[PDB]
Subunit: 308 residues, 4 copies
């Protein structure tokens, strides 16, 4: 039940730190014949790297994709330590590659005729290492489509979103790289809420993978709706990256200058997004600000049907 | 036509850098028998201090209040230089006091039986100097009700509001002072929009002072509505401080920890507002987030009628 | 036994946080008819402000100078808290002025025909407040002769000297002020060592004040010679300011650009001294780097004889 | 005339940005049967990476070592741009490996039974990338012996030495890595001066390689003795790393905590060296503070004789 990519599919590399949001992202990416996932690499944020790698293997096992090249990446942020303080996935059916993660990225990028899109959904540690170590491959990277950041209001500190906060230095390197970026930050993901009726649509999709996703969403309904945020349904974060790859017209986007703060007393990890063109600086990212929520749900339902 | 404060009025000191927003603030403050303005002191942000002092004198002349103690304050921010790059007020009918501005503040605060509310509407330079120099008077300061800051999105840099940006060090000292604060930032002032029909109500008030305010608003309609902000009407900033003094129930408020960033690469002048209680830090300000816009207009109309 | 200043004496204001180094400084300043001390103001660093003020009163009592205007200054640094963690002076014979310290400074500076030299020997908190609050008096300040800083190697943190570290913001304001500065930092004070034979010369001076100084030096010999510093004798810090006022030819000096670091992770409170002209920035201080140690001792002995 | 390492030699990797100091370092390293150079990798600081790689090839050609694995490294610092603004070496006789530089480092480190010493003499960019990307190899790195830093007084900015200043982020990562470090900073290299008579000793060594070194030193005598530094002879910087590997007893060393400043206004690139144990922090580097200069010259003369 592996989905075969079209020859004309967008080649991508998925760099992720799964828990559960990432899991849904991987499930959506691997459901689409419009995408060609060349490899999965793992990052670490608030779980040990052994755990995120194991979780990636469990997700790939769920999807019967033991053929997917997978490698564990950096064990900690570039210049800081990890910040360590649900429903069950199947036990892994296979072992990961022992190959170094950015070596694996370079191999796939070098070998791909078509420039590759990097899709990180955790801290940007591995992406930064790749950018800094393989300058000759930048022309073979189409874009970096990342989940991270917030154009003003953080969810980890008042100024910073979690993925960026974990490794501000890595994020800084990404935004300075000159490679095209699409930033899917909290501004859009806060709007990507799943309602009860949306979960029931997903649960009605007649395959095991949809059942897994619906269970994850049930869990999010209970534990990802702290009333202080004022959510009606549970937001989905990481899957917004895949939705943008598949149907970018779902999104309100603007080309902006974005800087990552690495020096402030209170603001380390902030993405400073010049939405109102106050700085005069050249835009370095496509920043997503809103989405067609119903269209997003429709896309998820359509995607998961591929596993029927 | 001077408005006589009630014996039970709230004593205040108005510290301001007028241009035109401040002018409306002073006009509203001096219209109310519920407030007792003890002095006016001037700060400087994007005009020379000679100009802001002259403008304060012109406003007080408009209001026939040459009795008001007025003194020019600091000529520049504490640790930075000024950032220097409309309709007409009457020429001044009187000279300012030569007394030092924070000496004048201390005199009035020391002499007031009732603790005094400081009401800054420009950079916080003079307020910080007062706080640091007169620790023995902190118990005689009720509150600092300031226009400044933004809980995430600036209007001068992407992270910072103008008044705070001009003098982040001064602002930092204010927020660290332990004196109660009400912060009227861009979050609320962006909502305090004046519509065409609101201006026409004000213009219909049968006195010269209302005519002046309506002319200022006409000007704001043309030049303070850069379409990028997406305003329907022209926002009023500084007058929100006076509205909070007179009718705080117009506002949505929350007790928050607020820190001022003075060290970041991209974020100097940001007010970091912990609206979602992520830091565990004790609240040091009442932050205003929304207001009853129609109620705000009604208050302005009622206030200006005092000059009939 | 008060020393009467010459009409042609250098007017000075002594701003200090005594413990014992400051005490010797005040004793030397008040011994010289070449200096005219207009007032003493107190700062606070690692003792409560009540203690430094009391100590100033005790020193002035020792010297039979209850006529000296004295006032306690700021109770804490501008943007930080105090860092709180010997032989006995006489009990105070008089009370301090209740006048605000920078108001007292302004009064004396305004009243002095001759521009006044400010001589701080503790954190620069009061000096910064004066500079920022009284811009119109800058032309009546000759120079600021301060004990503080180090051109590379701190004694409190690896990068910072104590006085600057206590209040980096205040120090920053001083060095940005445009008022001439002489910086007597650790580079020179480390060389200003008092040997056993020097103490015995001082002790032989036939008056009570010299006896007090010799006792202070005995104490320094025991407790101010941590072997890690590699001192042969006990350094005298604050008195180097007075020695520079009286006999500047004792010193090796160079005009340098100096910046105070207020933003770094590890370097807050550092004085960045461009001794090797690497920055291209205009010099803002006379920095002292070495002294004629024997000449310094000779000056002290000559000074203390004035109390005979 | 290749020098064959002893089986018991110290394995090293030389990471360098040659101009001329590095050249002398490579010449000394490759002269010693006590060292086993596994590879040469190039960094870039104030010359384009094509130039430093070419220069490394020219040095290896001089030494008849076309067998040495050599690879060009990062083309720019991690989070900053390069800072771009003598006698002749032979034209290269061979091409470099096309292999990625940190992949080459990992290959040699993984293959070496004996833990390897990394010896950087330029910006620490490649070393940081290796540390962050290959955590599993840290136990196979004996030590990092680097030329860089200064315990208080910089040669590029007042606070920072050049190699660290070029890439403070990389340096920060090195000092945080937990791998043993020997820091050969300006404190020691300033003392490593070559006198006229020392050059003439070297020139008398009867082989072409010594003649080359003497010519480089002649050049240094003219252009590396800006009188502001107060040098008597021309300092040698990078070769101090090799001297420490061969004869560490030439040096005065102390175990210190060292932090790299990446956030300050004036102090970015500073190495903050806690020589006086003020911070309580655990030591992370052996810092060199002085050397036996004559012994250093004697070592150089003895080394260059290996090419006879
Ligand atoms: Ca994730
Ligand atoms: Ca204003
Ligand atoms: Ca002192
Ligand atoms: Ca070098």
């Amino acid at each position: 039940k592996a989905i075969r990519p079209l020859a004309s599919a967008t080649p991508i590399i998925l760099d992720c730190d799964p828990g559960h949001d990432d899991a849904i992202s991987l499930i959506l990416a691997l459901s689409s014949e419009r995408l060609n996932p060349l490899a999965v690499t793992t990052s670490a944020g608030n779980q040990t790297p052994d755990k995120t790698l194991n979780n990636a293997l469990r997700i790939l096992t769920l999807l019967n994709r033991a053929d997917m090249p997978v490698a564990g990446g950096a064990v900690k942020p570039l210049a800081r330590e990890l910040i360590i303080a649900g429903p069950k996935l199947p036990d892994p059916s296979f072992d990961p590659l022992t190959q170094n993660a950015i070596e694996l990225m370079a191999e796939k990028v070098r070998q791909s005729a078509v420039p590759v899109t990097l899709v990180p959904s955790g801290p940007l540690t591995n992406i930064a290492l790749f950018i800094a170590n393989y300058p000759e491959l930048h022309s073979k990277v189409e874009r970096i489509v990342l989940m991270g950041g917030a154009a003003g209001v953080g969810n980890w500190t008042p100024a910073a979103e979690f993925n960026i906060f974990v490794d501000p230095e890595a994020a800084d390197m990404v935004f300075k790289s000159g490679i095209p970026i699409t930033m899917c930050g909290l501004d859009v993901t806060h709007e990507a809420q799943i309602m009860d009726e949306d979960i029931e649509r997903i649960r009605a999709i007649p395959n095991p993978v949809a059942q897994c996703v619906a269970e994850l969403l049930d869990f999010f309904m209970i534990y990802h709706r702290d009333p202080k945020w004022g959510f009606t349904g549970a937001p989905l974060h990481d899957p917004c990256t895949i939705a943008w790859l598949l149907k970018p017209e779902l999104f309100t986007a603007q080309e902006c200058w974005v800087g990552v703060e690495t020096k402030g007393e209170y603001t380390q990890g902030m993405t400073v997004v010049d939405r109102y063109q106050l700085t005069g600086k050249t835009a370095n990212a496509t920043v997503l600000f809103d989405l067609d929520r119903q269209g997003f749900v429709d896309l998820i339902v359509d995607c998961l049907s591929a596993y029927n």
